[PDB]
């Protein structure tokens, strides 16, 4: 006993957003069971080689993956992808990031006709830019219900509007030189994000290089955190978005998003009215300081950075462990004269190779996730605040919550794509110098 | 949109029966959507090596199976076992047996709590003998709804009670000598069923050898069909059962079922009252003639026999093709001096080996299935009859329907068990001569 979302329930859900794997819809009906929740629904994807097995079947886990993730029997026994992703979050990620900032959600049964109805709705409600993107996978029979982290609470409080900020921080550290070739040494001093911006700029996938440096955001320095926030505001690309009661008021158009112009900046400043009690023109600066204080105060990025640091070898190192795992002769090692560093990796007992690659894929989850920080203004006539920021410049107090979203299990075969991409980025960056 | 069976729906379903893979419950509620339907629910089984992969995970299909069944992409893409079994019936079996006698059923969503509730119900309602048998697999989220083939129509007609007969016919032919060793030649002249009865009798799994000979039932001769029916009645074991409005009135206690005694025979004769219009003591003979006429008249066994004959090589031959398929050195061939017959099999192109093994597993489906024949007496004031039998001795007309049940996909790894079992049966039978 609980429930199934049917064709008749589709009308209660409205498009919120999407990424490469999922569609997200917000609840818009009346039931107290669902107010302030979102539903996450998996897209259909062929064209993705990493999720296929040797027979071209999209299996929950490949035999190689089952072997890699063997430590959690629960995980490898997942009968479908919805269960797999839920158990990965619950059993692998939550022990690392804690339950306070991670919602694994609740699985709900869905009918085929509910999903076909949603397919049609997202086609109508999508931005034009996304109309040909992959739609819902109507062969799945579960979906995931999660709290809406664009909201602090299910309903509006009298204090003000709920403003929520979403950050895709990317990788906050630089690899050591230990498994990196002499020709690729800039990797130890220039961030992956910065190097990638150069390639995106050459491929005209962005109108200009972002001002954002993840090394600032993860620096441990309040000034540098503020710098990162100001930068994200200026050039949001797909790294920064802001919601007013679950509605986009900054960013959200993919990495193609325009850099904040006077017009965009002006509308945003007015969108903050009431939320920040400051005169016209001054709220933006207060808002950026608030986000900065919440980010720094929460310490949430320190813990994420430690999981990102589970990438101990860099992909240039870990790819060798990958080949050992899948029991193939290593083509990296054929490319030229192998480092002693690399040979020692192949010398590793198979248990250590397994552990290294697993930890690399967990780190990839941490490098690719997002954080949603939701804020609720307090009335001066409320009692004392959980976590909060006090803005002296407006003498306002804001409760806040931080949640990690988009914490997905990365397919083992993606190690190959990760290697190729890294190779291309460093090759490109090197010749641009 | 359709529905989910929830905890509250459990009360509408009552235990009907079970075999090694499934629990079956009949609908007992009021909804016209379900009256005259049964629900088939998969049991949980560990202890079954054939359904595990190389990692001990119970996958929908192994990589080897995906390769074997590659011809139906639909089949190999099944996301779970309920879909797999439904698509196997629809896409593989129905083209061979026809849609008239095969109901693939309809998948229904089920909640975990519905299944946990059913678990508890079947524990209460099971015969004591079956209380420790595997119960429902509560990790599945679908079940199968099928028409109740113990019933001719959803409700009772005024003509009489519905009497339904269920036959597990077993294999109706003898292999050729082509891939059988000289030491095992009795296989070409004595049925697998007869030989197996000897082993069961030694292992005291039956109180006595059955009188039933499948070669009679599949003979094409009306007299021999009648002989088989009379034999099944005498010693039902697990091959013969009879239902009165969905309630057991003969057989049903496993292969351990007692041979029909005077007491059992007397109760059965009274259970037929009204159904067969014949004086006390004479209905049983009329009933057996009726079943015989329906079986022979329908021709249904001719078509089943042709699918059983898809076992072209015998397991003694096909096991060699199995080893080629899974890309292993053949241990059969190591056992002693291989036949030329066997060597030629290993010489086969891989496409022919694949086809042979597939056809063997389809034949295994046909050898292990059951047929349910349901009867409805016609009133003398009804119009002319679909398929029917006229009993002159009572001047009664009976409409009948025949359905194949228990048409399951056999796991590839079971080839190993099939070989071992065959080896044991022929070894035992040989030394008993
Ligand atoms: N719990 C949530 N509450 C509110 N909004 C959410 C939530 N989860 C996701 N979203 C929004 O929906 C968008 C897409 O969700 P996301 O989980 O990133 O999709 P995805 O396809 O699984 N990720 P990716 O594969 O990295 O492109 C996010 O960018 C958020 O704006
Ligand atoms: N459609 C149906 N209508 C009425 N009764 C049925 C139906 N299907 C199954 N049954 C009854 O339920 C019993 C068990 O079903 P069955 O499909 O044989 O279970 P199973 O576990 O999948 N077979 P097996 O693995 O060969 O032991 C049968 O012997 C029938 O008496
Ligand atoms: Zn290598
Ligand atoms: Zn052989």
Curated annotation (Swiss-Prot), chains A, B:
One GO term describing the cellular component = nucleus
Q: How is the cofactor bound?
A: Binds 1 zinc ion per subunit.
Instruction: Name one molecular function that GO assigns to this entry.
Output: metal ion binding
Q: Summarize tissue expression.
A: Strongly expressed in leaves and cauline leaves. Weakly expressed in siliques and flowers. In flower, it is expressed in the major organs of developing flower buds. Strongly expressed in sepals, petals, in the male and female organs of immature and mature flower buds. Strongly expressed in the gynoecium and carpels which are fused to form the gynoecium. Also expressed in the transmitting tissue and ovules.
First-level EC class: transferase
Q: How is it used?
A: The gene coding for this protein might be inactivated to commercially produce plants with phytate-free grain. Indeed, while the role of phytate (InsP6) accumulation in seeds is unknown, it causes nutritional and environmental problems, partly due to the inability of monogastric animals to digest it.
Q: Which segments of the protein form a coiled coil according to its record?
A: none
UniProt record similarity statement: Belongs to the IPK1 type 2 family.
Q: What is this protein called?
A: Inositol-pentakisphosphate 2-kinase
Q: Which organism does this sequence originate in?
A: Arabidopsis thaliana
């Amino acid at each position: 006993m609980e429930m199934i979302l049917e064709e008749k329930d589709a009308s209660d859900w409205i498009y919120r957003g999407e990424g490469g794997a999922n569609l997200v819809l917000a609840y818009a009906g009346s039931s107290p069971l669902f107010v302030g929740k979102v539903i996450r629904i998996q897209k259909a994807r062929r064209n993705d080689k990493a999720i296929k097995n040797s027979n071209g079947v999209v299996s929950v886990l490949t035999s190689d993956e089952q072997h890699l993730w063997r430590e959690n029997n629960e995980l490898i026994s997942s009968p479908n992808k919805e269960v797999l992703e839920q158990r990965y979050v619950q059993n692998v990620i939550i022990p690392l990031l804690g339950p306070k900032h991670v919602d694994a959600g609740v699985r709900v049964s869905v009918s085929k006709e509910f999903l076909e109805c949603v397919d049609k709705k997202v086609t109508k409600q999508r931005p034009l830019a996304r109309v040909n993107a992959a739609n819902v996978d109507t062969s799945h029979d579960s979906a995931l219900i999660l709290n809406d982290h664009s909201l602090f609470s299910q309903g509006i409080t009298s204090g003000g509007d709920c403003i929520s900020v979403e950050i895709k921080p990317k990788c906050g550290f630089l690899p050591t030189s230990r498994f990196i070739g002499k020709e690729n040494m800039l990797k130890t001093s220039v961030s992956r994000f910065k190097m990638h911006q150069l390639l995106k700029l050459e491929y005209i996938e962005i109108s200009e290089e972002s001002e954002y440096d993840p090394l600032d955001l993860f620096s441990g320095s309040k000034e540098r955190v503020l710098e990162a926030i100001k930068a994200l505001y200026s050039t949001p690309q797909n790294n920064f978005r802001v919601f007013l009661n679950g509605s986009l008021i900054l960013g959200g158009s993919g990495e193609s998003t325009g850099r904040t112009s006077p017009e965009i900046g002006y509308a945003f400043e007015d969108a903050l009215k009431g939320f920040i009690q400051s005169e016209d023109g001054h709220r933006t600066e207060c808002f950026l300081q608030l986000v900065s204080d919440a980010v720094y105060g929460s310490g949430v990025l320190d813990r994420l950075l430690e999981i990102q640091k589970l990438d101990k070898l860099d992909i240039e190192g870990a790819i060798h462990c990958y080949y050992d795992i899948i029991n193939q002769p290593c083509p990296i090692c054929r490319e030229g004269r192998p480092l002693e560093a690399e040979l020692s990796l192949h010398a590793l007992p198979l248990d250590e190779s397994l552990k290294i690659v697993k930890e690399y894929l967990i780190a990839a989850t941490a490098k690719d996730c997002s954080i949603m920080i939701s804020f609720q203004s307090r009335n001066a006539w409320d009692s004392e605040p959980g976590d909060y920021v006090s803005l002296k410049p407006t003498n306002q107090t804001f409760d806040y919550k931080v949640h990690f979203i988009d914490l997905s299990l990365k397919p083992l075969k993606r190690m190959e794509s990760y290697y190729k991409l890294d190779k291309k980025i460093i090759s490109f960056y090197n010749r641009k110098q």
